[PDB]
Every structure is written in structure tokens, then in C-alpha cells.
């Protein structure tokens, strides 16, 4: 019964911000990986 | 950008420092000039027929 | 051998010790002359 | 495959724009 | 090309007309305080 | 009010060389090759 | 709940599960080592340490094995080109397997520690609250580090009980693993002196034993204990990140400049060696000596080892790559097959001409030939209409001495011009561009890739230090400042000493 | 500590800065650095 | 394309040596700086309203 | 000059290319061209984009 | 308070016009020496022996063109100490050899350490979270990568930036021509952070100022604010509605907004630093290999990426001989790349 | 804090008495530093006639690390 | 909390949480080792840097 456990959260806004960061990184770096 | 549109350009200190004889003593402005010259002569490499690029 | 650069190393070390030692001596002296209330 | 990948990432961003706007967490004045 | 030109001219006139009549239609009054 | 403070030293470590330098650069305006 | 960037903070108060996370991390790192080695073994061509060494092939862990004495494979070869050798268990394969098994054992321990997180050892005997005595853990660990460090130097490196370390001549032609005696004089501090490395481990290991025994026996002064928050495990993270970025900057630096621990036969030559024409000078010396003592020009150059010539080629300079130019060097210029031999250029007067070499700064570089005094004699013109120094006009020919093309002379201008374009890269080699579908564009070596990742990680670890140091010293205000912090402590002249309530005026 | 009014001290110090800076511009056109 | 425009522009106008471009740099470098500053000054000053675990 | 992804560009090299120097400052709408083929050759899309964009 | 240490601490932390602190013993002399080194060099010191350049007011340079220039390439990465083996305590020689460069770079480096310690120290005494210090790591990563890492990866300090306005411009153009630095995605994130930061600065300041509450009678609204007042001086509610309807999204959380203002430009500058670490090793983002193969095989294939490389090759050829004098480059006229006419 | 306001100090007659002397003395000292030519020799900066010898076609560039001091000296002797 | 054989044996080594020596304890001696470490680093940096050049110490591969 580990008393240290705690749930992760992610609100909607954070989901959108995270997806934007990722997508935008993918868009920016993809040219360099196709080379 | 809107005033360089009418060719009023950045400061030009090319050959501004001169020695006692009249030898040009280069400054960092002159090394800038050397890089600008590289850009100038290569850009649009087939578009100029006459010696000055006036626009 | 003490090469010229070893000697220079010792000079820089002393100059550094002097600068630091006098900086702290002055600050300590001044800190004690002028105590907070 | 390369053009497709670029257009696909782009299209995902445009869709992400539409949801972020129209299906945002509504701001609550409370 | 001619029909394209005429269509676009008509389009643009319509929107320009909306903008002009729009601001002619008592705009100063369209605010939340003194009207 | 004291006169010789930290503020005082800070001001003068800057203002003193500054005026010395300004006279030096003023003199330079009259040098010719 | 916890924001994503805080999930691992659930371990702060849970020593057992911290040890478990650490164990998992250790398991992944050792698992990586073992896996990487096998991938390298699966792709390494061991047939030619002269023109296809490990550093031409994108090998990253292979040189680290070789550096401390693992140089052989169970399949019978060694990295110096031997056949028939018997490495015992500790071939490259034995090392990879050992890391895999270790990874597995560590993973299982992680499991145990995660499950049995509530061990009475982790509780404060007085409070019942989770407690770790960090100052004494530090002494224990440092005692252990010192003993290992000392042992590594005393038995492994000296060869007393161990294989020694990789050493070579100053031109990286005859490297091998050897026992190395410590150097106790001032030259032990010379980064190119290997005896320095042995002395370092022996001496610094004794010092770590001693400071270790000290940190076990003597408690921290209260002054330090409070100032550094020695009851907060985050302080250790913070100083530990600091020591780690310091160390990461050092290994970037010594990989880039070279030292006795970054040998050129393992990581490739350094950019500076190209900068200073370090190999060209030695090749010239040997050729001059050969000649001084009677040799024909063909003999003198035929006497130059291919391996030495190959170092004197910009395709091996690690400052010639690109960030997105991936893979082994062989994927750019190709898999080197053979030295073509030393090109000598001459004009129609018989005057010897020298191609001006490409400096590393330049992605592309003109072809200019000077006489022995540096005067321009020939070139490849861009605009032709006012050309004065073309090969055609100057009657430039090229003859080869040593290598594949020994004794040949070429007078066709396009041909002579081709060899001269190769000569801007230094010595000229024949390559296989087909096996790998090489693209003709230079890539850096392991020396370059190692340097980049470590300098970048060292810099980012600086931010890590700053961040955790800040969390350590400001723990009390992490959720915000005091909701009713007296306006007197932030306004001016209310206190004699900034922040001190008792200095009120 | 109030004798000379701050507006005069400012107008005077401000005129000094103009003069010294005007001098620097003149020197752009004369002597060293003038391109002549 | 944008980079091409910048480079030809430097050749033809020496934009770097133009004081309006210099004011522009001061403008965007300063804008970044004061952004980092303002962001950081306000953040450093948030009143304690949340648990040691929850986002501030 | 090739600007588009289908004609061999990536996100970084790609562009909508400025209209022809032979046009100068002439107004080059789609109806001024003999065909879309010609319009595309001469960079008509650039004028359409930048004019609607600036007004917008 | 007790012993000498605590007395000194008292004195260091006195609430005076210019705070000192412990960090001040580092900060103040190093900031002052870096700055006075710059003013001294740009005023009186040449670059003739290191670069073949004039670089001071004494020689005729103006504010835009003076510099404290890097040492000669032959100096390598020498510390160039006044008392080192190069100058051997000779002050004049030291100045002539580039000694002021490393002087300013190293004092500036320790001054920057001092400033950030001053930020940690002041925040601890005022009882605030040290976010300002943390934000300042971005200027540190830039200074260290560009002024130290970069030249340390290259042949010598000569290739570091020289401390001057025009000298820095040269540095820019060198990076374009030699490294194609504009192509580099770490520089691009840098640009996004700097321009996004500047955008966030303009837009936040303008939004506050245009959703202010009327808390006074004055048509100048600056006086209608009180530092100690409980209430927001502007309406977040109206600001939020305005941006939502204008742009489609808006901040709703003021703590987020401010944190984001820290995050964007700080992260930006950090990214540019990583790219510059790459360039220390010539590990450039110079080319797209697929474009090169197509262009080599198809002489009718052209893009803006090919066009800009012709510019770079112009920059290298035309600037190198005067910019890298120790290489003794002689490039006869016929070898210089040039288009038609120009 | 504590210190006398700048406002007070710079409007006070005693301030102007002290600085009507110290400001100009420093300025003039700055001027002489240049006019005597003293600046050139302290810093090792060439005067307009000391960049090149009369027929010299190349720059006195330092090319040696550990004898660069001696090279400058040599380069300086032939002017 | 679970006692184990090995935890019992190790218990003493994790028993002095929070324990401090009084005052400044060995701070002065620590500072001496710190200054000496600083000089050490300074020496090895300057050797690598060829700012400090010692007899019979050839900082090169060429030995
Ligand atoms: C985070 C933020 C923290 C806050 C900011 C802190 C600011 C503090 C200031 C510290 C200053 C450190 C300066 C180090 C100078 C240096 O390196 O000087 C370089 C010297 C080596 O000297 C060089 O060596 C080169 C290679 O030579 C060798 O090879 C030659 C050719 O073959 C010859 O054989 C020669 O004899 C042989 O020595 C060339 O000779 C160069 O001219 C010469 O400069 O190494 C050395 O002193 C030491 C080498 C190892 C230690 C490096 C640790 C620190 C540097 C990490 C930087 C990463 C660099 C990687 C690039 C990415
Ligand atoms: C220190 C780490 C390190 C180093 C120095 C190397 C070095 C090397 N590897 Mg190894 N490798 C590593 C770790 C490393 N590797 C790890 C962890 C793995 C498991 C994934 C591997 C698996 C591996 C394979 C399978 C192969 C190599 C090979 C190579 C060689 C070529 C490298 C290359 O092309 O990179 C190119 C690197 C890049 C293009 C990456 C550049 C940096 C990126 C862009 C960072 C991303 C930025 C990010 C988006 C920022 C966002 C933050 C946000 C807030 C903005 C070289 C010797 C190749 C070979 O030759 O082997 C024989 C090979 O086949 N490696
Ligand atoms: C030994 C090194 C070390 C360790 C043990 C930690 C551990 C910690 N950090 Mg610090 N940190 C470090 C170095 C380290 N950090 C460095 C180098 C930086 C600068 C880059 C930071 C910057 C940093 C910030 C800004 C924060 C922390 C926080 C934390 C805490 C929460 C971690 C978490 O839940 O992440 C969760 C992480 C994820 C869910 C995924 C992150 C994915 C990353 C971006 C890429 C994936 C990494 C890759 C797969 C692994 C290879 C990397 C490795 C080779 C270097 C934890 C105590 C947080 C804390 O303070 O909370 C109170 C916090 O806000 N760290
Ligand atoms: C916080 C103040 C501070 C700091 C951190 C520095 C740091 C630096 N200075 Mg600067 N300087 C300062 C203030 C400072 N300075 C002041 C106030 C002046 C006016 C006097 C100068 C004037 C100056 C000059 C003219 C030069 C420097 C230089 C340097 C650099 C090398 C210093 C060195 O090698 O020291 C070595 C010495 C130490 C590090 C001191 C060691 C202290 C330890 C802890 C105690 C050891 C004492 C020792 C054992 C006892 C004597 C030895 C005996 C037994 C033989 C370095 C960047 C050089 C440089 O910039 O070159 C490009 C240089 O030429 N400084
Ligand atoms: C911008 C740089 C910077 C900043 C702002 C901080 C800030 C912090 N450090 Mg970190 N640190 C840094 C760089 C920095 N550090 C470096 C480069 C190292 C070496 C690896 C460390 C090693 C370190 C440790 C091990 C610890 C800290 C800790 C701390 C915290 C308390 C203050 C402190 O101890 O400072 C220390 C003082 C300084 C960084 C300034 C040093 C000034 C030097 C001595 C001047 C030297 C002159 C030199 C000899 C001249 C020769 C030059 C030569 C090239 C010729 C705070 C978070 C402590 C902590 O986290 O508490 C919870 C902690 O335990 N630091
Ligand atoms: C839209 C155009 C644009 C934008 C927004 C940027 C933005 C940026 N550039 Mg790029 N640049 C561009 C176009 C652009 N660039 C083009 C077309 C090129 C040609 C390729 C370049 C070439 C270029 C180079 C070569 C470099 C940059 C760098 C940078 C970064 C500099 C950050 C900084 O503030 O450093 C300013 C310096 C610091 C912040 C260091 C700390 C300074 C301390 C705090 C100063 C304290 C001063 C003190 C108080 C004394 C005052 C005295 C007074 C008398 C002067 C930033 C991301 C740099 C970089 O990437 O760094 C990693 C860099 O080296 N750029
Ligand atoms: C050019 C003018 C600069 C000011 C414009 C900034 C726009 C930012 C976006 C709107 C931001 C915004 O909403 O601001 C609002 C802000 C305060 O509004 P108030 O309503 O209180 O005052 C303005 C009017 O109502 C008259 O009281 O306006 C000012 O402070 C005006 C200051 C004028 C100062 C005198 C005239 C211009 C001189 C400014 C200094 C420039 C020096 C030149 C140096 C090279
Ligand atoms: C006429 C209409 C004009 C329409 C324009 C369409 C604009 C699209 C707006 C951005 C939507 C995406 C937002 C997702 C994220 C999202 O939903 O955010 C909504 C979020 C709401 O902030 P709050 O303060 O409500 O969040 C509470 C926080 O505490 C989170 O826990 O806004 C921000 O964070 C503002 C800062 C980010 C602003 C970023 C804009 C980015 C621009 C896009 C750059 C890349 C473009 C790539 C080109 C291919
Ligand atoms: C304590 C502590 C820390 C750690 C501290 C540590 C590990 C300190 C260790 C320090 C050591 C090993 C210092 C050694 C210094 C050695 C020195 C100064 C030797 C100098 C030798 C000289 C000057 C020799 C000169 C000569 C030479 C070269 C040739 C001869 O012919 C002539 C002669 C003798 C003059 C942490 C990590 C910084 C954390 C906080 C607390
Ligand atoms: C280096 C060195 C050192 C040091 C020195 C020093 C510390 C110095 C300082 C110096 C200084 C401290 C100087 C100063 C200067 C200043 C000046 C020269 C100024 C000018 C100004 C002006 C000109 C103004 C302008 C303007 C502006 C800015 C804006 C507004 C308008 C106007 C335009 C007015 C020693 C000895 C230790 C040692 C060896 C080396
Ligand atoms: C190409 C440009 C076109 C040139 C036309 C410009 C010449 C000026 C003509 C003005 C005559 C129209 O006058 C204007 O029109 C609209 C529509 O009829 C009116 O009608 C409007 O009245 C009120 C004004 O409070 C609005 O709230 C209401 O929605 C609307 O019906 C305006 O109140 C009237 O003032
Ligand atoms: C030079 C800065 C180093 C400061 C750290 C060393 C503190 S040392 C400390 O100092 C006390 C007075 O405060 C003395 O009474 C005591 O004997 C001594 O141990
Ligand atoms: O188009 Mn685009 O760029 Ca304006 O300059 Mn003239 O023209 Mn063309 O050359 Mn240079
Ligand atoms: Ca092929
Ligand atoms: Cl172009
Ligand atoms: Cl024309
Ligand atoms: Fe705000
Ligand atoms: Mg003049």
C-alpha cells in the first residue's frame, strides 16, 4: 500500500499545447531527416 | 526596409581610414564590404548584362 | 627548473593572492568599523 | 512519401487549430 | 478570362459595398456606453 | 549625510575615466594623417 | 494531480523506489552498452585496420572496448589485423554478453525494490519517517569510488593484474594494448603522457579512500549542513549535476584536442593535425631522409606507409562533416581501397607545382597551384575570357610516386585537372563508392560525434544544475512566496540589512 | 544643497553632451577616418 | 526564400550598417529580454495558493 | 525556379515564388493571362496571395 | 551576529543604493574590468598585428567600427595572460597581441556568473522564487557557446566574435557564407523564441494598457495605480474575450501567461546555443543531400536553397583573403566566382 | 535607503566648486594623453606614418605564438 | 516497515540522519583543500594550454 503514489494530470489546453509542440517540431525537423 | 526601398542605404565606411602615405587601412567595415561583394557578384548570376546593378 | 613561464605562473598566482587578500582585508576592516544596529 | 508527410503534418496542425479554437476548455468567470 | 474578370469585379463590389454601407449605418452608436 | 559611500565609489569608478576618455577622444578629432 | 514534468517526484520520499528507478536506469544503460556492441559487431568489417579502421565505419563503443584492452573477437580476429588470436572470454562478444546479463540482473533487483519499497532501513529509527543519511552515504560511496579508482590504475592499467591500455607512436601507425607504468614526475600532467593516466588513478584513488574515511567518520559542520540543505536529497542532485557537466566538458575537450586517452587509431585523427599539416610534415621528413640516403623518388614515396598517407587526407578530418550527414565516413567519400600515390605537378618548364590545400572551414575551394615560394603558377579558372594560368596554357602535367599510380604521368588537361581537385584534400586515394551507395559528401568521425553530443549534454546539464540548485535553496517558496510577506522587507531603508527583521531602524 | 536650480544644471549638462557629440560628428569629416 | 531576400538585401543596401535596422535589433532583442524579465519577475512573485504537488 | 513540394522542395527550401521581373509592377491578375499555364509560369500566384493578404 | 564572517555578511547585505552581497565580490570587479577593457581597447588599441585592421577611435574608427579584436590565429587558444609566455608581462606587447580580447572574454564570463549569483542572492533575501536567475541561464548559454565553445572548437580565438558593432556583423556574414547558419533548425528555434518573445512583450503590454480599469479621473492613466492595491489594474475578463473573438484563442490564466513569457525566449536562446555548439565542430546544417544529387544531375533544377549556396560561395571566395590573413590566400581574378557582368 | 539624494548633491554650490575644477582637469588630462602622443606608446598603436615601411607591400601580421612579442619588435624596427 | 537480515546489518549506516558537528567544524580545513584544488586545476589547464611550459613536458603526441 504505497502512500507516495499520485495521479498524473493533463488538462485539455495542455493536451493541445503538447500536440502543437510535437507537430510543429515534426514539421520543422522532418526536412532535415529526409535530407 | 521602406527607406532602403528608395536606396538610402546603411553607413558606408569603405576605405575610411587612410595612412600617412595614402595606403587604405582596413577596418571591420571593409571586411563587411568583402562579404557583401561576394553576395553581389553571385546573386542572380545570369540576370545582369551591364556593370552596375541599379535596381 | 623554474622556466620563464613557471616564474610567470608564480607571478600571476601572487598577484591573484594579493588582490584577493587585500580585498577581503579591506572588506573585513570596513565591516567591523561599521556594524549594523 | 516526403510530400505526403509534409502535407499530413500540416493538415494535423490545421485540424489542431480548429479544435483549439472551437472545442477549447471554455473560460469560466467563476 | 473575361467572365472570371466580371465575376471577381462583382464579388469585390459587393463586399466593398457592404463595408461602406456598413460603417454608414450608425457605427458610432454601436458601442456599450454613450450612444 | 556621509560623503564617501559605496554609491560614491561606484559613481566615480565610472565618471572619472569617462571624462578622461572624452577629452582624449575630443583631442583625436584634430589628428590628421 | 502531478503535472507531467513532475511525475518522478513521487520518488522523493521513497528511498526504496528511488533505488528501484536507479536500478532500472542502470539496467537500460548497461543494456544499451551490450546491444550497441552487438550491433557494431554485426556491421564491423575487421579485414583492414589500415584503410578501413573502426573510426571509418561509425563505430562508437568498439573504440572504448579497445582502449582498455578488449581488442579481439571470438571469431578469431583482432583490431590490429591479427588472425588466430584467442581472446578468452573477454572478447568484444564476451563484454556485450556480460552487459546484457548485468542489465537483466539489475532489472530483476529493480522489480524487488519497487515491490519491497517499505524496508525498515529506509525509516528514521526515531521518527519513523523516510530518511537517508546523505553525508554518510557520501563517505561510503566515495570510499568505494577511491578503492575502485585505485585498483583500476594499480592493477589494470599497470598490467600487474589486467591488460593495460591502448598506446601508440606519435603518428598512430602501430597502436596496441600495453602495460603502462605510472609517471610521477611533472610530465604526468601532460595529457599526451599515458603514465600520467596510471599515476592519476593510483594517486586520486588513494585520495578518495582517505577523503572517503573522513566523510564516513566526521559529521558536517552545522554551518555547511544548513547552508547546503544537507537533509534534502535535491542538494545532491544539484551538486552531482554540476560535477557531471564539468566532467562532460572535459571529455569533449580531450576528445577534440586529443590526449593519451583519445588515440587516433580508435577515434580518428584530430582536426588540428590537418590544421598543422602534422602528417604531411612527417611524410615529407621520411621522403627527404630516403632521398638524402640515395633513394629514387619512386622508392622514397613507395616507402611511405599507406596508413600514414591516409591520415594526411581531409576526408579523415573530423571537422568536415554535417549535423544531418549520418552514418560512417565510408558513406561519404567511400570505403578507402588504396593510396593512388603522391601526385607531383609540373608546368611546361619542369617547375614543381603545389596545390593549395582545402582548410576545414571551406565546403568548397578553388584549385590553385603555387611554386615552392608561394607564387601562383596555374589554376582552374572560373571566368575563362581573361584566364592566364589555366592548365592548358601552363602545360600542367602530373606524375605519381608510390601507390597504385607509381611511375605514371598524365598530360591530358581534364585528367590532370581531376587529380588536382583531389589534391586539395591532401593525399589521393581510390575508394569503393558502390558497396554503400556513398554520396561523395564528407561525414565526421566518432571523435566529432562524441565531441558534439558531450559538449551539448554538458551545456544542458548546466541548466539542470541551476534548476535543481534553485529548487534546493528555495524549497520553502516553490508554491509561491509568503502570502503576507511584510512590505517593510521589500521596501527601502526600513531595515539596515536587506531581509533581516532584527536590523529594523 | 538647493542653490543651483535643477533645470539649469540639466540644460547646461545637456548642452555639453550636444557639443561633445557635435564635435565627434565633425571629426567624422576631417582628419583620421574621413576617407580623405 | 526569405534568407535569399536577406542576403541580397545586405549586398545591395548594407542593411546591417543601417541604424533603423539596428533599432530593429534593439527592438526584438529588447522585446525578448523584457519578455523573459517580465515573465520571470511576475512568476517569481506568485502568492502561495497551491499545494507542493499541484501546478502553481 | 522551383518553389513547390511536388516539384522537388521540402518545407525549408519551398516557397511561393515572386512574379516575373518581365512584369515589374504591372498588375498581373488571372484574367490578364492567356491561360493558367502562363499565369503559373510568370508567378501570378504570388501577386494574388500578397495583395489579398495585405488587404486582409 | 557573532564572528567575523557574520559581521562581513551584515556589511555585504546592507540596504544601500547599489546592493553588494557576496556575489558582488565576484560581480563588480569582473563587470568593471570587462567594460573598461572594452572602452579602453575600442578607444586606444589597434588590431594591426592580429588582423591587419584599425579598430580604435585613436586610429580614426567610429562607434560602429571600433572593436577589441580577437588575437592572431597563431595564438591558438592561448589564455594570453599579461604575464603569460606570449606577452611576458609587457603591457604594450600584450595589447598588440590581442590580450584585451581574452581579458574581456574571461572577465565578462566571470562577471556573468556573478550577475546570476546576484540574482540568486537578492531573491533569497527578498524571499522570492529565483525565476529571474533561471531565465538568465539563456544569456549565459549564448555567451558561453558563442564566445568560448565556438572558438575552442575552431583553430583558435581568432574565429571568435570580436567585441565591436561592425565586427559582430562580420561574424553574422561569416556564419551565413561558411556555416549556412540560416538553414540550421536550432537557429530557427532561436529566431522563433526571440521574435515570439518580442511579440509576447508587445502584445501583453498593449493588452494590459487597453483593458485598464478607470481607477482615476486623469486622461493620463499612469497615476491611477497603487503598488499596494489589492485589485487587478486591468480586466483579464475583457482581455480574454477580446483575443478569443480576434485571434480565436486567449490566455485565461495569468500565471500561465507569465510563465509562458519566461519560457519562449529562454528556450529560444538555449536552442541557438546548441546549434552554435554544433558549428564549433563545423557540424553544420549546410546542405540537403537530396537537393544536391538532383541538382548535380539536372542542370534545370533550381530552388531558393541552391540560390543561397551560390551566395555563400561568393561570400567565402571574396571575404576570406582579407578576413583570414594568416592563410596568405592569393585568389587570382580568374578563379573568383562571379555571375554575368558583376 | 540612506545616501544623500543626487538631486541635492548636484544643485549644491559646494558640488559645483569641486567639479568645476575636477571635471576640466580630467578632460584636459585626457586631451594631453593623446596630444603628447603618449597614448600611441602605452598601447602600441601605430601613428599614421607607422603602419607600413615606405616600400613594404604586406602587413606585419604575428605568425608565431611564443616569439610574437619579438616579431612585433622586429616588425617595429624596420619602419 | 519490513526488517530483513541485510537491513539489520546496514541499519547503523543509515542511523545518523540530521547529525551535525557544532558550528563551523572543519570548514577552515575544507577551504584549504578547495584553494589547493583550484590551483591544481589551474596548473593542469595552463599546461594543456601551453600557458605553463615545463622542462621535459612536451604537450604534443610527439613526446
Ligand atoms: C556552463 C557554463 C559555466 C559558466 C561559464 C564558465 C566560464 C569559465 C572560463 C573557463 C575557461 C576554459 C578555457 C579552456 C581553453 C582551452 O581548452 O585551450 C585548448 C587546449 C589545447 O590547445 C590546443 O591544442 C590544439 C591541438 O594541439 C595538439 O595537436 C597539435 C597538432 O597535431 C600538436 O601536436 C600539439 O603539440 C598538440 O598539443 C592546437 O595546438 C591548438 O592551437 C591549441 O590551442 O586544451 C586545454 O587547454 C584544456 C583541454 C581539456 C580541457 C577542456 C575543458 C574546458 C573546455 C571545454 C570546451 C569544449 C571544446 C570542444 C568544442 C565543442
Ligand atoms: C552520445 C551518444 C551517441 C554518439 C556520440 C553516437 C555516435 C554515432 N553513432 Mg550511435 N547511438 C546512440 C548514441 C550515440 N551515437 C544511442 C542512444 C543509440 C540507440 C538509439 C545509437 C544507435 C546507433 C545506430 C543504430 C547507428 C549509430 C551510428 C553512429 C555513428 C553516426 C552518428 C550519426 O549519424 O548521428 C546523426 C545524429 C543526428 C542526425 C541527430 C542530431 C541532433 C538531433 C537533431 C536532436 C533533436 C533536437 C530536438 C528536436 C530538440 C527539441 C527540444 C524542444 C524544447 C525545442 C556515430 C559514431 C551509425 C553507425 O555508423 O554505426 C556503425 C549507426 O548505424 N548509432
Ligand atoms: C541526473 C540528472 C537528472 C535527474 C535524476 C533529474 C530529475 C528530476 N528533474 Mg531535472 N534536469 C536535468 C537533470 C536531471 N533531472 C537536466 C540536464 C535538465 C535541463 C535539461 C533538467 C531540467 C528539469 C526541469 C525544468 C524540471 C526537472 C524536474 C525533475 C524532477 C521531475 C522529473 C520528471 O518527472 O520528468 C518527467 C519527464 C517526462 C515525462 C519526459 C521528459 C522527456 C524528455 C524531454 C526527453 C526524453 C529523454 C530520453 C528518452 C532519455 C535520454 C536522455 C539522457 C541520455 C540525457 C526530477 C527530480 C522537474 C521538477 O523540478 O519538478 C518538481 C522540472 O520541472 N528537471
Ligand atoms: C573577483 C575578482 C577577479 C577575478 C575572479 C579575476 C580573474 C581573472 N583575472 Mg583579473 N583583476 C582583478 C579582479 C579579478 N580577476 C582586479 C581587481 C584587477 C586590478 C588589479 C585585475 C587585473 C587583471 C590583469 C592585468 C589580468 C587579469 C587576468 C585574470 C584572469 C587570470 C587570473 C589568474 O590566473 O590568477 C591566478 C591567481 C589566482 C587564481 C589566485 C589564487 C587564490 C587561491 C584561492 C589562494 C592561493 C594563494 C597562494 C597559495 C599563496 C601565494 C603563493 C606562494 C606560496 C608562491 C582571470 C579571468 C589576466 C587575464 O585576463 O588574461 C587575459 C590578466 O592578464 N586581471
Ligand atoms: C553561472 C554560473 C553558476 C551559477 C549562477 C551557479 C549557482 C549555484 N551553484 Mg553552481 N557551479 C558552477 C556554475 C554556477 N553555479 C560551475 C561552473 C561549477 C563547477 C562544476 C559549479 C559547482 C557547484 C557545486 C558543487 C554546488 C554549486 C551550488 C550552487 C548554488 C549556490 C551558490 C554557489 O555555491 O556558487 C559557487 C560559486 C560560483 C559558481 C562562482 C565561482 C567563482 C570562481 C571561484 C572564480 C574563479 C577565478 C579563476 C580561478 C580565474 C582563473 C581563470 C582561468 C581560465 C585562467 C547556486 C544554485 C551549490 C548548491 O547547489 O547548493 C544547493 C552546490 O553544491 N555549484
Ligand atoms: C529575423 C532575423 C534574426 C533573429 C530574430 C535572430 C536571432 C538570434 N540570433 Mg541570428 N542571424 C540572422 C538573423 C536573425 N537572428 C541572419 C540572417 C544571420 C546570418 C546567418 C544570423 C547570424 C547569427 C549568428 C552568427 C549568431 C546569431 C545568434 C542569434 C541569437 C542571439 C541571441 C542574443 O541575444 O545574443 C546576445 C548575446 C548574449 C545574450 C550574451 C550575454 C550578453 C550579456 C548579458 C551582455 C551584458 C552587457 C553589459 C551590461 C554591458 C553593456 C555595455 C554597452 C556599452 C554595450 C538569436 C536567437 C547567436 C547565437 O545563435 O547564439 C547561440 C549567434 O552567435 N545569429
Ligand atoms: C512614437 C510614440 C511612442 C509611443 C507609442 C507606443 C505604441 C505601443 C502600443 C500602444 C500602447 C498603449 O496603449 O499606450 C497607452 C499609454 C497610456 O495611455 P493614456 O490614455 O494614459 O495616455 C495617452 C492619451 O490618453 C493621452 O493621455 O499611452 C502613452 O503612454 C503615450 C505616451 C506618449 C509619449 C509622447 C509622444 C511619443 C513619444 C514616446 C517616446 C518615443 C521616443 C523616441 C525614441 C527613438
Ligand atoms: C480570423 C481568425 C484568425 C484565426 C487564426 C487561427 C489561429 C490559430 C491559433 C492557434 C491555435 C493553436 C493553439 C493550441 C494551444 C492552445 O489551445 O492554447 C490555448 C491556451 C489557453 O491559455 P490558458 O491561459 O487558458 O491556459 C491555462 C494554462 O494554465 C494551461 O494549464 O493559450 C495559450 O497557451 C497561449 C499561448 C500559445 C499561443 C500559441 C499560438 C501558436 C501559433 C501557431 C504556430 C505554428 C503554426 C504552424 C504553421 C503550420
Ligand atoms: C574539499 C572539496 C572538494 C575537493 C577538493 C579536492 C579533491 C582537493 C584536492 C586537491 C589537490 C590534489 C591539490 C594539489 C595541488 C598540487 C599543487 C599545488 C602542486 C604544485 C606543484 C608545483 C608548483 C611544482 C612546481 C615545480 C615544478 C613543476 C618543476 C620543479 O623543477 C620546480 C618546482 C618545484 C617549483 C570539492 C570537490 C572541490 C567540493 C568542495 C570541497
Ligand atoms: C583594461 C585594463 C585595465 C582596466 C582599465 C579600465 C577599468 C578602464 C575603464 C575605462 C572607462 C570606464 C572609460 C569610460 C569611457 C566612456 C566613454 C568614452 C563614454 C562615451 C559616451 C558617449 C559618447 C555618450 C553617448 C550617447 C549615448 C550613449 C546615448 C545618449 C546620446 C549620446 C549620443 C550622448 C587594468 C588597468 C585593470 C589592467 C590592464 C587592462
Ligand atoms: C461606392 C460608395 C457608395 C457611395 C455612397 C455614399 C453616399 C452617402 C449616402 C448616405 C445615405 C445612406 O444613409 C445611411 O444608410 C443606412 C442604410 O440606409 C441607414 O440605416 C441604418 O440606420 C441606423 C443608424 O443608427 C442603423 O442602426 C440601422 O441598422 C440601419 O438601418 C443609416 O442610418 C443612414 O444614415
Ligand atoms: C574567506 C571566506 C571563507 C569563510 C568560511 C570560513 C569560516 S571559518 C570560522 O570563522 C569564525 C568567525 O566567523 C571563527 O570564529 C571560527 O574560528 C572559524 O572556524
Ligand atoms: O532582381 Mn532580385 O536583385 Ca534588386 O538588385 Mn538588381 O535587381 Mn535583381 O540584381 Mn541585385
Ligand atoms: Ca551510387
Ligand atoms: Cl540570388
Ligand atoms: Cl543588366
Ligand atoms: Fe504582466
Ligand atoms: Mg577625424
GROMACS .gro file of C-alpha atoms in nm, chain K residues 16 22 26 52 84 93 127 141 143 151 177 190 207 216 226 274 277 291 306 316 335:
model
   21
  894UNK     CA    1   2.212   5.065   0.012
  900UNK     CA    2   2.880   3.814  -0.160
  904UNK     CA    3   3.283   3.843  -0.796
  930UNK     CA    4   4.575   4.392  -4.028
  962UNK     CA    5   5.194   3.455  -1.988
  971UNK     CA    6   5.301   4.387  -2.645
 1005UNK     CA    7   1.211   3.589  -0.024
 1019UNK     CA    8   2.438   2.965  -2.267
 1021UNK     CA    9   2.775   3.391  -2.424
 1029UNK     CA   10   3.636   2.935  -3.100
 1055UNK     CA   11   2.876   3.206  -4.600
 1068UNK     CA   12   1.625   3.075  -3.168
 1085UNK     CA   13  -0.336   4.431  -2.383
 1094UNK     CA   14  -0.882   5.775  -1.175
 1104UNK     CA   15  -0.119   5.191  -0.644
 1152UNK     CA   16   2.302   2.409  -2.916
 1155UNK     CA   17   2.797   2.414  -3.025
 1169UNK     CA   18   1.868   1.855  -5.347
 1184UNK     CA   19   2.056   2.632  -5.447
 1194UNK     CA   20   3.376   3.261  -4.889
 1213UNK     CA   21   3.926   3.195  -6.011
   0.00000   0.00000   0.00000
